Design a protein around this ligand. Structure first.
Ligand SMILES: *C(=O)CCCCCCCCCCCCC
Lengths: 855, 41, 66
């Protein structure tokens, strides 16, 4: 469900120069049929509107936000002769692509309407018809958008398509005038295409962008170029490499997961992995000996337990019938693999039913709204444990819920222990392999020596535990360590309330206090404590001096989502994103009691030198740094290392290695080691880098240039953060006019002043990562505090779509946004509107007082 | 090269292909024609 | 018609000549041989990026065998 998610990558001079020949090639089974089935199935089940509309809106908005340093502004102004190549009609009845009219109407924030658009394409209706890849007579456009299919011309393969892409790039190259820009669509990103792009186009632009809106699990891509026919030395960079890595990885994972659901509009009979199980009894009898349905319901329960099971009681064809429905999943049927006898159920809940219930119609994917945050958080949590357990491992789980999710997650040959307080409900006498339960506290004492165990867990538990006992996170952690000290375990998994970056707040979901080390969950209504990374680390170092500690990353993985799709738990993009953000402060600690230690030496902040010393090795051994399943670098090749800075030294006196680095992305990197002339891989601890502070201060002078040049002000910002501005209209973020404020360089921002700016607040927001406003959301309260002149001419525009009527010293003159408004003879309109929405013009009011009242 | 789910072509980079340059198969297409105009009348 | 037809292929012929000449596709006496994966892996390593074979493979191969 939900809207689409956009990804982009921009060119930066500062990165390592990657070549065309080492970007990830596309998969080779990409055309083999079952994958095609998966792509079909995912696309059919997508709650969304006109795809061509939403993609084009995304790309146009992100295209009106690319600046030329040489002239301090967008390559995308207004009035630009714009060619839409590939104008598919669209059988919706508009006969045209469904964004042109909203575009020119200026019904998009951040996208000034153009002069005109010319629609060329095979299936155009309101334009002209031609096959573009070959020459055709036309005039010159300033911006050329492309949405051309390449799975049509050229027969069914990939090299002919590769040639089509070059043809299209050259044709667009010719259509644009010097200094213009163009966007092209790519069906299949293959290596030789970027080879061609690098040796044929890159030296003929000024900047370039890559963009990927994600609406269906595919490999579609958009490539954007600026400043055509101007020479530079642009080549692919590090960010391109990383982006392509993720843009293939995500696809591969989602395709695997999607390839398991039953076909769209299928016939469930029990063999399918996911099905709507259901059984009914005609004229039910409960009170006396049944032995007929007492097994009947129990079989279904064992089939699909722990998943929501719904009932109806009604009458059909004269017979009083009871119907049971539910759903089966790999985990639900994995639980069945662990029983030996069949557990049975008390039916007392049911014979008491004296009411009447209508039946219903089976729907596999039941949810209509999108999955809630915390359920998804729990799923993304449990994927880690379900992956991190192999067969036969002797398991001790703490915080075990009464419903015992674990009995549905691990293999059916691993003994488990439930360590919790409330009595469970799971049966006792049907378990093929060992399974124990307990009624006591896992923060308590004097119960540990008697319990076997290899992997010890605690998930979404300890923060509430510490809060309940009025206990701090530090003390709670140390007491848990103490309890595990005299145990016999081997590896520990613990969810930990502790940040991973600059402390921020997630709106309405998790609000964080930096006075007392406390989180708050508003939807849950509770105040809990936390602690800090370095504080916790020493405690783990104490009881285990052989402790290798890692902080497993999640806010790029999607494999965890397989714990949803396979029991029909509908997903929303927003519910995903908030789950990553919430996870950046509720991470998971993976502690090995006898791994190889790693000590953190320097200051771990982006833009700062870091240092690590890794003991206990030999000079003939390697290390590899990964980041989002990429490869930052390896020691064997120090030079072609994708990170900004590498160092490598060895202490033949002590056998201690030394790596002294600089990074460029906040988050988690992982270092892994390679020992010997063998393919064997060891897993050393990972580490976290964090972004520089989010703090902002700004200077506002005393003289205000109410003229066109406009006042210029100082905004002190650490340069790593890139900045823009926004407005909140109707609860929705709108892009501020690039013609209104101009950043440039210290840092100085330009602004044209207006009365309208008094009645709208303005925010400086940050777009460097995938998300926006997560680190810096700084309102400009100073802007809503301006002191107008009266002896001075003024810019002026309407605030919004409401109905503001002007007053000169409390005397209405006209009415903005009114039917049958008439312009004053002393007012005057301005060439390019300063408004936040391009439709609303901007006028020139002659000197005086101007007051607007809402109505 | 295979642009389709089912392949019934000739896998150029597939196996089973044969490269045996032989004297008997000395390549040629159309070097010259007896376009002499006396013989063309 | 013949002359103008032969005009168009003025480059494609050159590319095919490059393909057949970069390594010996003819011998004076007897017969020689070499695995196809190797020789194909070579061609994708020496033909210029602009060569039409890089974008039109199968027809080039069948023409070669013709
Ligand atoms: C099949 O998987 C499509 C990609 C591979 C096609 C073969 C390589 C492209 C060029 C043809 C032969 C290589 C030497 C020119």
């Amino acid at each position: 469900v939900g809207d689409a998610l956009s990804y982009y990558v921009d060119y930066n001079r500062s990165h390592r120069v990657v070549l065309s020949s080492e970007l990830p090639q596309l998969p080779d089974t990409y055309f083999d049929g079952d994958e095609q089935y998966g792509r079909s199935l995912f696309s059919l089940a997508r709650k969304i509107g006109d795809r061509s509309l939403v993609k084009d809106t995304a790309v146009l908005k992100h295209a009106y936000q690319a600046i030329d340093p040489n002239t301090g502004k967008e390559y995308l102004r207004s009035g630009q002769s714009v060619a839409y190549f590939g104008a598919s009609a669209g059988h919706s009845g508009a006969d045209q692509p469904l964004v042109i009219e909203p575009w020119i109407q200026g019904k998009i924030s951040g996208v000034p309407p153009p002069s005109s658009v010319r629609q060329f394409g095979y299936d155009v209706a309101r334009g002209a018809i031609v096959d573009l890849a070959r020459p055709f007579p036309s005039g010159d456009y300033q911006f050329v958008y492309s949405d051309v299919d390449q799975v049509v011309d050229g027969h069914d393969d990939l090299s002919i398509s590769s040639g089509l892409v070059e043809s299209l790039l050259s044709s667009c190259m010719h259509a644009t005038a010097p200094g213009g820009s163009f966007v092209v669509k790519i069906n299949f990103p293959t290596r030789p295409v970027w080879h061609y792009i690098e040796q044929k186009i890159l030296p003929n632009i000024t900047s370039y962008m890559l963009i990927k809106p994600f609406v269906t699990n595919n490999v579609e891509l958009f490539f954007v170029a600026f400043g055509v026919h101007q020479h530079s030395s642009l080549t692919w960079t590090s960010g391109v490499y990383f982006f392509l890595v993720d843009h293939f990885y995500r696809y591969e994972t989602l395709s695997t997961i999607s390839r398991q659901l039953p076909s769209f509009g299928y016939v469930d009979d029990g063999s399918s992995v996911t099905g709507i199980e259901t059984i009914s009894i005609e004229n039910p009898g409960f009170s006396n000996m049944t032995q007929a349905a007492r097994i009947g319901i129990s079989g279904l329960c064992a089939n699909v337990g722990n998943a929501r099971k719904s009932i109806a009681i009604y009458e059909s064809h004269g017979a009083r019938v009871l119907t049971i429905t539910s759903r089966r999943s790999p985990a639900s049927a994995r639980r069945k693999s662990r029983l030996r006898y069949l557990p049975l159920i008390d039916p007392r809940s049911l014979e008491v039913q004296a009411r009447t219930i209508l039946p219903a119609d089976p729907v596999l994917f039941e949810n209509v709204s999108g999955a809630s945050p915390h359920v998804c958080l729990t799923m993304m949590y449990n994927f880690e444990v379900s992956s991190a357990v192999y067969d036969g491992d002797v398991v001790l789980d703490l915080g075990t819920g009464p419903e015992a999710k674990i009995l549905e997650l691990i293999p059916a040959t691993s003994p488990v222990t439930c360590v919790d307080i409330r009595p469970t409900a799971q049966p006792s006498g049907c378990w093929n392999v060992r399974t124990t339960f307990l009624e006591l506290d896992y923060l308590s004492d004097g119960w540990i020596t008697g319990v076997r165990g290899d992997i010890v867990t605690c998930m979404l538990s300890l923060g509430a535990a510490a809060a309940g006992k009025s206990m701090t996170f530090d003390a709670a952690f140390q007491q848990l360590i103490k309890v595990l000290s005299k145990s016999t375990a081997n590896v520990v998994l613990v969810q930990v309330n502790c940040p991973t970056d600059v402390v921020r707040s997630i709106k309405g979901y998790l609000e964080i206090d930096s006075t007392n080390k406390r989180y708050r969950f508003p939807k849950f209504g509770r105040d809990e404590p936390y602690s800090d990374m370095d504080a916790l680390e020493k405690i783990c170092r104490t009881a285990w001096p052989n402790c290798s500690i890692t902080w497993v990353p999640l806010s790029y993985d999607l494999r965890w989502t397989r714990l949803a799709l396979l029991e029909s738990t509908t997903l929303s993009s927003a519910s995903i994103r908030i789950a990553e953000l919430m996870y950046k402060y509720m991470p998971i600690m993976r502690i090995d009691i006898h791994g190889l230690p790693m000590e953190k030496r320097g200051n771990f902040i982006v833009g700062q030198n870091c240092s690590l010393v890794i003991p206990g090795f030999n000079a003939q051994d390697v290390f590899n740094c990964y980041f989002n399943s990429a490869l930052a670098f390896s020691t064997e090749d120090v030079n072609a290392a994708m990170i900004p800075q590498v160092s490598a030294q060895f202490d033949a006196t002590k056998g201690e290695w030394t790596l002294d680095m600089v990074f460029s992305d906040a988050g988690i990197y992982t270092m892994q080691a390679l020992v010997g002339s063998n393919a064997n891989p060891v897993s050393l601890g990972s580490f976290v880098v964090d972004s520089p502070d989010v703090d902002i201060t700004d200077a506002w002078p005393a003289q205000l240039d109410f003229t066109i040049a406009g006042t210029d002000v100082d905004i002190t910002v650490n340069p790593y953060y890139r900045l823009m501005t926004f407005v909140r209209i109707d609860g929705q973020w709108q892009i501020a006019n690039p013609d209104k404020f101009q950043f440039f360089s210290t840092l100085v921002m330009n602004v044209k002043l207006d009365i309208a700016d008094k009645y709208l607040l303005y925010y400086i927001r940050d777009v460097q990562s995938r998300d926006v406003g997560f680190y810096i959301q700084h309102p400009l309260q100073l802007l809503n505090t301006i002191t107008l002149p009266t002896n001075e001419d003024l810019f002026l525009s309407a605030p919004d779509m409401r109905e503001w009527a002007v007053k000169e010293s409390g005397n209405t003159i006209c009415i903005l946004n009114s039917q049958g408004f008439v312009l004053p003879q002393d007012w005057d309109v301005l060439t390019d509107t300063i408004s936040w929405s391009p439709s609303i013009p901007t006028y020139i009011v002659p000197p005086g007082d101007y007051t607007l009242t809402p109505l | 090269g295979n642009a389709s789910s089912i392949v019934q072509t000739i896998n150029v980079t597939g196996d089973g292909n044969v490269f045996k340059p032989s004297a008997e198969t000395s390549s040629t297409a159309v070097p010259s024609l007896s376009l002499s105009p006396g013989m063309l009348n | 018609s013949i002359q103008a037809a032969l005009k168009a292929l003025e480059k494609w012929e050159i590319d095919l000549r490059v393909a057949q000449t970069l390594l010996p596709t003819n011998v004076p006496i007897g017969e020689v041989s070499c695995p196809m994966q190797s020789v194909v892996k070579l061609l994708d390593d020496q033909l210029p990026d602009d060569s039409l074979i890089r974008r039109y493979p199968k027809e080039a191969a069948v023409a070669l065998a013709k």
